[PDB]
Amino acid sequence: MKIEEGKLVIWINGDKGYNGLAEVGKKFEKDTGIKVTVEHPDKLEEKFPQVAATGDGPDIIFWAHDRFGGYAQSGLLAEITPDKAFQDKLYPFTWDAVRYNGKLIAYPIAVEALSLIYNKDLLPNPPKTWEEIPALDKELKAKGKSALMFNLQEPYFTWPLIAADGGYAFKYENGKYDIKDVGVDNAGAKAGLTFLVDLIKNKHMNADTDYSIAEAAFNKGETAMTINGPWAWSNIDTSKVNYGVTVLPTFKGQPSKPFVGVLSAGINAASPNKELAKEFLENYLLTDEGLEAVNKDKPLGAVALKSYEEELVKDPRIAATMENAQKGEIMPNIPQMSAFWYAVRTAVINAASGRQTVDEALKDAQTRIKEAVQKFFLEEIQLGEELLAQGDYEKGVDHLTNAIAVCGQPQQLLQVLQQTLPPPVFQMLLTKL
């Protein structure tokens, strides 16, 4: 319990280059004395918030930035304090992905986006744009031995299709997300998922296809294309398949819109080694030499460090990654992203398996998301009132702002609060808007 005392523990997903990370740690331990222990547990993005509520867990946790707003919101993450000189060394937009309540809550590392990966021997010239070729993606598989295999179990991999003709998580009106304008239930979304289920009903894909199956199929030459991120490339090299990495096909003339993750590194708020964790991230990991050591293990994508990214952009595969990234959307980092992912994972699994229709499946996902934002609103009103009565006004009012962010009529609620708050507390609330 309460790990540890003068060492660093890091968690990263088992699909990343954790051996390369451990190399950077050794170098850290050599220059310094401080041992670095890198682990790759399962469901780390769900294990993390549990054990960090304990006050336990790792010092540093790696995940895509979408989860981090939820951690920050629960107070599991220390604010980070790069000094301007250092902020200049990373791209502004990666710095935006790790901003929550106007505070930086992680160090951005890399930009990950899915791409179409194809076997050049089986298939020189991959199915363009889809969109006279989904008839022919459908038919390209008709020259059987399998045209396409990728992970149906995780909705990250199916979203690019669900979103192509208008599906979406939460609407932007010009910046602020309108949580409760949810788009998993709409025409665009129903059509993309329908097309997916039709691929399965016509026997071009198996609904039980997972990560390892698809990885294995492509790596043995049994299928002509997979959908995957840069981490997968090193295995494909090892497999000695002659492969390309290209743009995802379009749907109804429109590009596939992947959700783009920025692999990020948060510092546990309960960590006793926050200054050590900072020296490592800024002065070891985030260096040309640190990122190359991770990248040689499993490629990172387009790194957030400019000096190093200036070399990687000469790789066509990285050009392919960035096109797809540009055509898609950078993920929200808001706490509701969790409910979104879980709702949609259930919709995709159920429709593919046949347990519900496309429509029923997306409407139950739409409903679950709305219910999660509503639950969260009640919680935050309650929390808000309590941490006022205990005189922790700054936190007390922070929860009231959270509630207002997800409200039906936020103006009606602002009135009630000026009526129930003492004026200084009300003013202090307006600063947290």
Ligand X SMILES: OC[C@H]1O[C@H](O[C@H]2[C@H](O)[C@@H](O)[C@@H](O)O[C@@H]2CO)[C@H](O)[C@@H](O)[C@@H]1O
Site mask, ligand X, residues 233-272, x = CB under 6 A? ----------------------------x-----------
Per DSSP, 284 falls in state: I
Instruction: Pick between residue 228 and residue 246 the one whose CB is nearest to ligand X.
Output: 228
Instruction: Pick between residue 66 and residue 282 the one whose CB is nearest to ligand X.
Output: 66
Residue of the chain from 23, 59, 66, 292 that contacts ligand X (CB under 6 A): 66
Least gap, CB of 316 to ligand X (angstroms): 21
Least gap, CB of 352 to ligand X (angstroms): 14
Q: Which residue has the tokens 């979203």?
A: 159
70 binds ligand X (CB under 6 A): no
Spatial neighbors of 136 by CB under 8 A, at least 6 apart, are 127
Residue 253: CB atoms within 10 A of its CB come to 11
Least gap, CB of 342 to ligand X (angstroms): 8
Instruction: Pick between residue 17 and residue 384 the one whose CB is nearest to ligand X.
Output: 17
Spatial neighbors of 350 by CB under 8 A, at least 6 apart, are 356, 361, 364
Least gap, CB of 218 to ligand X (angstroms): 16
State whether the Cα torsion 25-31-33-34 is positive or negative.
negative
Least gap, CB of 71 to ligand X (angstroms): 11
64 binds ligand X (CB under 6 A): yes
Instruction: Pick between residue 309 and residue 398 the one whose CB is nearest to ligand X.
Output: 309
Site mask, ligand X, residues 142-181, x = CB under 6 A? ------------xxx-------------------------
CB 31 within 8 A of CB 288: no
Burial class for 345, CB neighbours closer than 10 Å (0-12, 13-18, 19+): middle
Separation between Cα atoms, residue 343 and residue 182, nearest integer Å = 12
Least gap, CB of 124 to ligand X (angstroms): 29
* Helix, coil or strand: residue 112: strand
Helix (DSSP H) and strand (DSSP E) numbers for the chain: 18, 14
112 binds ligand X (CB under 6 A): yes
Separation between Cα atoms, residue 350 and residue 230, nearest integer Å = 28
Q: Which residues pair with 11 in a beta bridge?
A: 39, 61
Instruction: Pick between residue 158 and residue 273 the one whose CB is nearest to ligand X.
Output: 158
Instruction: Pick between residue 45 and residue 165 the one whose CB is nearest to ligand X.
Output: 45
Least gap, CB of 149 to ligand X (angstroms): 16
Separation between Cα atoms, residue 229 and residue 261, nearest integer Å = 10
CB 29 within 8 A of CB 36: yes
Least gap, CB of 59 to ligand X (angstroms): 20
Q: Stretches 33-41, 60-68, 124-132, 369-377: which one binds ligand X (CB under 6 A)? A: 60-68
Residue of the chain from 17, 20, 62, 67 that contacts ligand X (CB under 6 A): 67
Q: Stretches 64-72, 83-91, 99-107, 126-134: which one binds ligand X (CB under 6 A)? A: 64-72
- Reported as type and span, the H/E element at residue 430 is helix 423-432
Q: Long-range contacts for 232-240 (Cβ within 8 Å, ≥24 apart)?
A: 232/15, 232/117, 233/298, 233/299, 233/317, 234/17, 234/297, 234/298, 234/299, 236/117
Least gap, CB of 392 to ligand X (angstroms): 30
Instruction: Pick between residue 228 and residue 366 the one whose CB is nearest to ligand X.
Output: 228
State phi, psi for 7 to the nearest 5 degrees: -125, 165
17 binds ligand X (CB under 6 A): no
Residue of the chain from 13, 32, 194, 206 that contacts ligand X (CB under 6 A): 13
Please give the size of the binding site for ligand X, defined by CB under 6 A: 12
Least gap, CB of 211 to ligand X (angstroms): 7
Separation between Cα atoms, residue 357 and residue 186, nearest integer Å = 14
Instruction: Pick between residue 28 and residue 62 the one whose CB is nearest to ligand X.
Output: 62
Instruction: Find the binding residues for ligand X in span 326-385 (CB under 6 A).
Output: 341
Q: Which amino acid is at 305?
A: L
Least gap, CB of 317 to ligand X (angstroms): 17
Residues that bind ligand X (CB under 6 A): 13, 15, 45, 64, 66-67, 112, 154-156, 261, 341
